[PDB]
Amino acid sequence: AFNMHNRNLLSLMHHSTRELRYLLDLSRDLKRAKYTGTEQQHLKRKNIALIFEKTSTRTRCAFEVAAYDQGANVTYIDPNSSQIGHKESMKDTARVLGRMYDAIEYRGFKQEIVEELAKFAGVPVFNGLTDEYHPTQMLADVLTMREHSDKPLHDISYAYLGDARNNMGNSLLLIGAKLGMDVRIAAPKALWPHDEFVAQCKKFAEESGAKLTLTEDPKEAVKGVDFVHTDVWVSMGEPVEAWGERIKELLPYQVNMEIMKATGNPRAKFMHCLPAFHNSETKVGKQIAEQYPNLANGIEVTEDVFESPYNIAFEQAENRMHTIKAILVSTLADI
Amino acid sequence: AFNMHNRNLLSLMHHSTRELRYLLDLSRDLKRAKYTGTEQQHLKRKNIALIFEKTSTRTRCAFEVAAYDQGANVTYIDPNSSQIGHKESMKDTARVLGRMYDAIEYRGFKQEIVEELAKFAGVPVFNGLTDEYHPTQMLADVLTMREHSDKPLHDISYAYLGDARNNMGNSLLLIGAKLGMDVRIAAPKALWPHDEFVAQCKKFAEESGAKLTLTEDPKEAVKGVDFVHTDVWVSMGEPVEAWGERIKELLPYQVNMEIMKATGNPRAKFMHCLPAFHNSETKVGKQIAEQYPNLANGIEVTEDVFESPYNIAFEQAENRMHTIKAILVSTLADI
Amino acid sequence: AFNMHNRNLLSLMHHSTRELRYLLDLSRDLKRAKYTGTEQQHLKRKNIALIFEKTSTRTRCAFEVAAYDQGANVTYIDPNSSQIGHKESMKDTARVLGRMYDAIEYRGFKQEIVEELAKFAGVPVFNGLTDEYHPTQMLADVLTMREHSDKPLHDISYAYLGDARNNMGNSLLLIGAKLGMDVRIAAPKALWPHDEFVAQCKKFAEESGAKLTLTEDPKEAVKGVDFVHTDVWVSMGEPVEAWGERIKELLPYQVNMEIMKATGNPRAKFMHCLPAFHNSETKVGKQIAEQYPNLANGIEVTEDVFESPYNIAFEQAENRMHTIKAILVSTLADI
Amino acid sequence: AFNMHNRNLLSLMHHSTRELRYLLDLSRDLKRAKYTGTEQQHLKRKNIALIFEKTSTRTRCAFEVAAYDQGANVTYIDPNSSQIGHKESMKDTARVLGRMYDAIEYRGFKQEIVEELAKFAGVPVFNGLTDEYHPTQMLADVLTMREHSDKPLHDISYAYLGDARNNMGNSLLLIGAKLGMDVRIAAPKALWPHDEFVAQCKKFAEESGAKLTLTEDPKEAVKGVDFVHTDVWVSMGEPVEAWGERIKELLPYQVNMEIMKATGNPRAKFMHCLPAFHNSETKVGKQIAEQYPNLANGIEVTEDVFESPYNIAFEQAENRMHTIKAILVSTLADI
Amino acid sequence: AFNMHNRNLLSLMHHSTRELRYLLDLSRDLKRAKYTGTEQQHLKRKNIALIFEKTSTRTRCAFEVAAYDQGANVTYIDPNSSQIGHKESMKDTARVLGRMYDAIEYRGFKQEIVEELAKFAGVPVFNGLTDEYHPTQMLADVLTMREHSDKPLHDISYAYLGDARNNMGNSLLLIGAKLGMDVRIAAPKALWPHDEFVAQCKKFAEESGAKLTLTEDPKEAVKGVDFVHTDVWVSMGEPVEAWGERIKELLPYQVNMEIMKATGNPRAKFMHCLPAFHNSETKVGKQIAEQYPNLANGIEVTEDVFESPYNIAFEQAENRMHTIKAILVSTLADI
């Protein structure tokens, strides 16, 4: 049968349009099967190592729940118990772990670490996140858009506002390009994906019928679009006191009711991969609100938009589990 | 059938006498069923998130073992991977988690956090501990007392000595009041539960036939009682050097052989929810013994009492698992 | 049937030659059964607590995978959630845990802690590692040697080079002595096992037909041997700057191609219990290489030997799981 | 969990009060589970050797039925096929049998034989009866008393009349002493248990709160008691013609309606471990009736008492099976 | 449904024609089901006591195999371990056994013992044989005849030659009478069944349409008959030396080729319930042959007839198992 057995998931760069559609279909069906009670376990007796170099509760929980639903077991290796590179090489770690587990998930920093893991483990390897890509999130995003739209994938338009020179901007552009979707990126020119990377997406877009539009004008990027996406651009690393400029620079790209209106579509929906800074209800948010009283009603998205029917972020977050299950099942199942 | 399906466990304040007795009965029966080998799994394929804002090995292990016995799976979210309030609101966390898990356990600080979790999760929520209440422990305590007594619940008398202006004093009084038990609290007047809270327990006591006695005299509180309860009152937060006054103040309420004798009952038993500071065998205990040579044989309870047939603290600790299982089963099972 | 039901694994000191051979046989058979697909689960519904006072991913993963394969569940208690001795005695912890779990694994420092755990738990207790012994590793080592050799156990010769005044030197000598194997230890006289301990191994050797050779000459210790073992001797506790002397002292015992050649056997294999410092590919290794440019190609073993057919360290690491399974099965199974 | 896995049952002398209560609880629950249809088999695939040096249909049938209910198999070795000591030592027999069976039951004469069996078998060993003790019967007796009484164990009083210098007198005193029960023995001073043995029971009684009363006056021993126990004292070994003196001597201790009345309790019940000589309906009984016309209506108990609501001997006999099952399950089950 | 649940099998005297036919039908069907592989076990978890006061391998094996096929367990109580009446009454034994087992089989001497067993056991009781009746054998005989004949039961004729004043003569007459069969008994007038018994069979025969013919002339009794039955008449109790008269007296009733011919039917078959004395191949037979050289070729039946196609004794013996199974199933099964 058409299958993707023993396949890794490192970036989506080497996954064809037919492969991605298969995974989207499988996600949809596995989702319906759980809610319907028709799900069958095909990962019984599979043991999966989840290595997290940096804590990520949403990705972790998504992997745990998916694995458990399918009858597999997981060993969660936290940031403290994990320091690949410090005392032992990833080549060595991969060789030991590949001999005890059936598949390995890795969530870290350098993409080449995940690729080294994949080179030496001997078992399927999944990238839970790196600086360059976030493959699981993209499949979750498209599925959400797909089930919250009446048009086929190639008829969907979407815009991502904010800092795009990262694994989210890089990824949102790539999956739209592989699926022939109309994708727009509104960001300051300095915060755009690397030209070398856009150039590879233009390559995929020409093979799939997609249109990639990069621009610095948000209202232009959001016109007649079906979904508005964004993400936290504020730097949690830099002290709240040193954010003044980045806020000044990224604030016009903020998703508020006005941008939601500017789409000119009453059906448009909002998406954020979470956590989102949509208020002061947080402790960090209360500080931000201080140094910048203006950001008291949200930073990248406002409470108005966030706590409204526009927001489908939670369905989107749920779809992260159904999607990874499709990855585990297509890769490891006896089907 | 009479049931408590889809019910939360946040404080026991909104649980009737019939509901608590049902849970006590179910705990007893599930306990006998495990030892007898007649236990059947009714939580197969249930996934439960255990959020611990503060490490609590006994509560954690009790939840893990109960869930596993019943065929469910658990995702343990530790204090490091958990900071509800810092970077993301509990309203947001609850909405995401409620979409991946079948029930959520929360162990933290502010009771309103657990209540917010419960308002927004969409799935049953259990309180593993807060500053105001410790519901799971109370059911475990009454069951232990119940199986280590010949009288029915309403015939049992018990006294708790020590600091009562906390989740233990608050809770021990509340469950005795809902079950028509004779409950006595011996503590300095300043360390008594809030009057507003005692007033609500007086309300429940008048409906159940209970007698709540608060007093500063320990020998009086322990007369003709069936069980003597206590707990660590010494402040682990404050440096051992600054404990002199609290020790001076709380020392007369210490459970020793004399208090055990003063009950005038050869059948009376001792209870402590653990860990207990009954000697110097610990590292902290060795320090305490230094600044206060007198506390070298125990602080809230003495080694004499602790390492004697009086002590049923370990059965009590075991009953914490059988009890939470009754909570999981009554709330989530297919029965 | 001949069995070791309800038996602890604390040091191997009280395990006879027949018992160790049974375990080696069971490991071999359980290994073949997993690869063949004939494995049956006999730990279904068993709950096991894994206490790790110090992080040990390889031992942890070995226990997790073994337990899961056999149908049991595990509760991993990390170094943060575990401080036996600080706030609560091991006697108390053991009493509570022994009432919720079916067996307890402990990995810590003082051997007497594990022995106290075993005295009071009431359920089987396994030592995952202490300063004095590492029982699980030894069974894994002999099995590996056994399956990578054509001679029976008593015909196998092996040498361990490096610091021997520790749980590895202590253990490698003990298991060779209980099995009538030809064991050699090449180390500076100061880094030899205690005489009192060697004396007890001489006792076992005289009962099994073994030959224990301690010496300071590595080429002599490695002559005509089947396996060369070693381990990290460099002190991770002491700053890299203060290692000059220990390196000076232990460097001649380093396993390189020359020592591999000096065995005079083209069949000889290399063993290391990992992690190994065989290059600069690590961050610590890059620092070491700086202060000591000479150790840029490996410290206790060189990259030449490590990345060659001589190296069977990864099979050895895999055998750590099959072995612990034999421990869990012989101790807890319904067989 | 609290357990007694791999434990032998040789005399009850080394079983604590908590252990005996656990077994009483388990017996009660396993009994209810069989009648309720909730029993689950946990001895599937267990093979048990039943060695009977002397025919004992009631003990044999109790063991067979218990084992079968639980899914195990049994090999009954009769008195003819069994002569441990004649042609082969028990040390040798135990070593062979311990290698084929999962547990061994022994019913013979010298207690040290059972203890030798236990020393060398390598599998759990149960004592079905010796000259010194009858452990299975005692658990059966207390359970019966417990379920036919409204008071807790420590509130129960019982008297055994007849020859007490045997495994019944020895045993009835021991189990009452370990459970803090009020036990009375009415017998001629010469037929009392050894002082050395009473002294050890006084030791246990002082730890449990029991009162042991030995006396030669039956009406005194039976005052306000809950259960009257007795047993055949007549010597089946000695010809009926030579019984005149023993009958003369033991006749005043006979349980008749008068003794039943003398208890001063209308709730008191009668117990006998069977077979009982309560009439002439037997062939031996018809002979006895001849030489001693007076014993035509019963010897140790009379037909009046035996065929009346006082008699609970048959429930008592049934409880012998539920009890041994608790022994098999606690010792060998996968629970 | 039409059923015979909880029914005893003591003599067949209180079993109607419809009940016996049901059992014959069930036997036939259970037999076909075993050979066809369609048999289902409906006695799973049933425990059956087989009491044999006198060794009877064929009846014992028939009961064991039937029970085992159906999933039940059996406890075989041999003649040594069984002496109902000696030391303990059957009323007492029945009361104890009825509490441990689900049904009891009894094979002894006095019919009233089996009836006493049945009065007091509380569970179904089966008569494996007494002096008066042999119910299981009769059902086995008719079934055999039925499957080795083309006519319906009421069209079958059969003759039994030999000593008829016993459980075989008594039984062969009774089952023919309850089923409206043509039954003939050829025996010396002194060896006929009691008149009181024949009179009761005449009663049944008049209700079923049967013809009972008693006579002293064998050739007359065997004319036009379908089956010739016989049995050992020689007294194993009396020494071979004292048999001269009984042999003289019973010899003309011997089944030889002449009697087989005298039936005037080439289809007629021979039946014997075994063991049969058809030669000298035995040790007893070799002695008989000595004192009486004439009986060297068979006593009640000759080797000619026995080792010929006439003989269906072995099918008959097999049918003893299928028949008892019908008894166990109709009485105890969940159908």
Added chain:
Amino acid sequence: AFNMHNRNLLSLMHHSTRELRYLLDLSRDLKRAKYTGTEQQHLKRKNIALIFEKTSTRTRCAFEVAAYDQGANVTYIDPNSSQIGHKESMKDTARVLGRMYDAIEYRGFKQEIVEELAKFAGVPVFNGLTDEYHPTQMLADVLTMREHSDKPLHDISYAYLGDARNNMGNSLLLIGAKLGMDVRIAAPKALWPHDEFVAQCKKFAEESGAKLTLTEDPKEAVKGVDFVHTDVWVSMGEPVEAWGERIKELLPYQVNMEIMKATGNPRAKFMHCLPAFHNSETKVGKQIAEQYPNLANGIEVTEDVFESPYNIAFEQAENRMHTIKAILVSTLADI
């Protein structure tokens, strides 16, 4: 597949070398499968009759346990309930039993009885022992030797000392001859196997490459041998008083430390099929010790040798079960 379905086991005389090796392999594998927990039952619903003309607890228990492990049932027919030949021929018994059971085991005296059983039963027949052969023991012996040796079967040397003109001497020689093993028999010339029998073994030896050495010199027979076998030669039939000559005659063939040393192999092991007379600990042994004070430390083997690492008699005894299972499985299983 290569199989031995429906095959009897009467002597091993008609079993080829390939067949015996298959059985040795199957025994080894079934043994590993039981200890590993991978055993599957393939005799479910099989009923096996075990006829024992002479009590043999070790063979009986071996058959019972094997059958039970595999899911079959057994009917044990004891020496009292069995007298084939007395009242009924084996031809008749075999015909009846072959119709109720799936296989029959026979343990008696005359080999021709077992062969008659096999001729007429119609189901597989196994010889548990006769005067001429003991097939099950031989397979058990070779397996034991095989697993306690490093050489292949044809490289193994063994010597049997004692009376060889019996089923042990006959059998030990035959299996060595069929497997090309170096077998030596040290015995007085009068106690050697019949020449006619040795001649047939010489025939098999020439086809397998074996060397059969008969001799009267024990030290010569034991030189460079791997296993020393022996057996009780003392006549239990003849009164201890009449043994003087046989002891005088057979004493030099006794296995003591000297003979163990005389093998010139530190690896050599001792074997005895049990029971062994290695001391006075028995009642018979205490008598022997009297008439012959010299035999107070063992007769055919001494306590020194018996209670030492030389002795593997108990493993040997265990292997009797794994071996018969291979016989039952190869003969009756659905594989």
